[PDB]
Design a protein around this ligand. Sequence first.
Ligand SMILES: *CCC(=O)Nc1cccc(Oc2nc(Nc3cnn(C)c3)nc3[nH]ccc23)c1
Length: 300
Amino acid sequence: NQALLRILKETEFKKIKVLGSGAFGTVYKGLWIPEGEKVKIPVAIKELREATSPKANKEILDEAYVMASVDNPHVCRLLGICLTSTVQLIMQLMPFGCLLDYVREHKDNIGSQYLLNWCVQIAKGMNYLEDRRLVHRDLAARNVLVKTPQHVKITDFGRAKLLGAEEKEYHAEGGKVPIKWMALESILHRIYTHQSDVWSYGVTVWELMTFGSKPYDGIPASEISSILEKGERLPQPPICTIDVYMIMRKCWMIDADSRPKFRELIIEFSKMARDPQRYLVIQGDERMHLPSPTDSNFYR
Ligand SMILES: *CCC(=O)Nc1cccc(Oc2nc(Nc3cnn(C)c3)nc3[nH]ccc23)c1
C-alpha cells in the first residue's frame, strides 16, 4: 500500500553477480526471499563503500525511511535495507540497464513515441522529487534506468539531497561533479536547486534525441562555463522540430527562474507525446519496433 522500508537480515537475500561499481560502492544483481513469505524477488543490491566516518545505525535508518517513502512510477524505489558491517540497500532491479546505453544499442529501432514518452516519464519523476523537496543533482541519461522499453525510472547513487522546509538551495562542497550536465550556478558556485535539475533535464533530453551522443563532445570540462557564458548551447538535434528544441533551450537559460518548471515540462511533453510524429521527424519512424507484450498478438 504505502511504501514502507523493510529491514532485511542477511538470511533473506543473496548477491548473485556484480552489475557495476563506483565511488559509492558496488551494485549487484540479487534475489530477495523474505522470511516466511515463499516468494523470490529479483533485486539490485547496493553495498555502500566504507566511509571514514560511518553514520550510526540510527542515522542510517532515519535516512532510509525517508528514501523508502519515495514512491513514484518513475523513480527507482528502495525496497529494504540490511545493516551489518556494511550498509546494503535493496532496490528494484531494472532489467534493461541504463537508458543511455539502451538508446545507443537500439537507436535504429527507437521512434518518436518512445522518445517523447520517456521525456514525459522523466519529467513526472522529477516533479515528484521536487514535491518531496529532493534535489537530484545528477540527472543524466546514464542515471535513468529501464524497467521495460516502455517504462523508465530515475535512480540516485548518493548525490541527491533533501531540502529543509524553508531551504530553496543546497550548497555543495568540493569534489568531482558532472560538469557537462550542470547549470552555470552549480558550476561556478556549487549551488543546486530544483531549477538546476531542470537544466540537467534539458541535457538529458538532448542525449535521448541524439540517441546517446556525448554533450559538448571533445570539449574540456574546464572550458564549459566559459562557453556557456558566451551564450553557446547544445545544438538542435536533427530529429527535433523547433518546438522541441525551444523547450530544451529554455532549460538552459542563465536565469534559473526563467527555466521551465517540471510541472510545465510534463504538460508540454505530454501534448507532444500525444502526436509524436508532429514533433520529432525520424526516417522510417512508423516502421520501427521495440519489444512489446503485444508482439504475439500482431505476429511481430
Ligand atoms: C549507463 C549507466 C550504467 O551502465 N549504469 C549502471 C550499471 C550497473 C548497475 C547499475 O545500477 C543498477 N542497475 C540495474 N540493472 C541493470 C541491468 N543491467 N545492468 C548493467 C544494470 N538496476 C538497478 N536498480 C537500482 C540500481 C540499479 C547502473
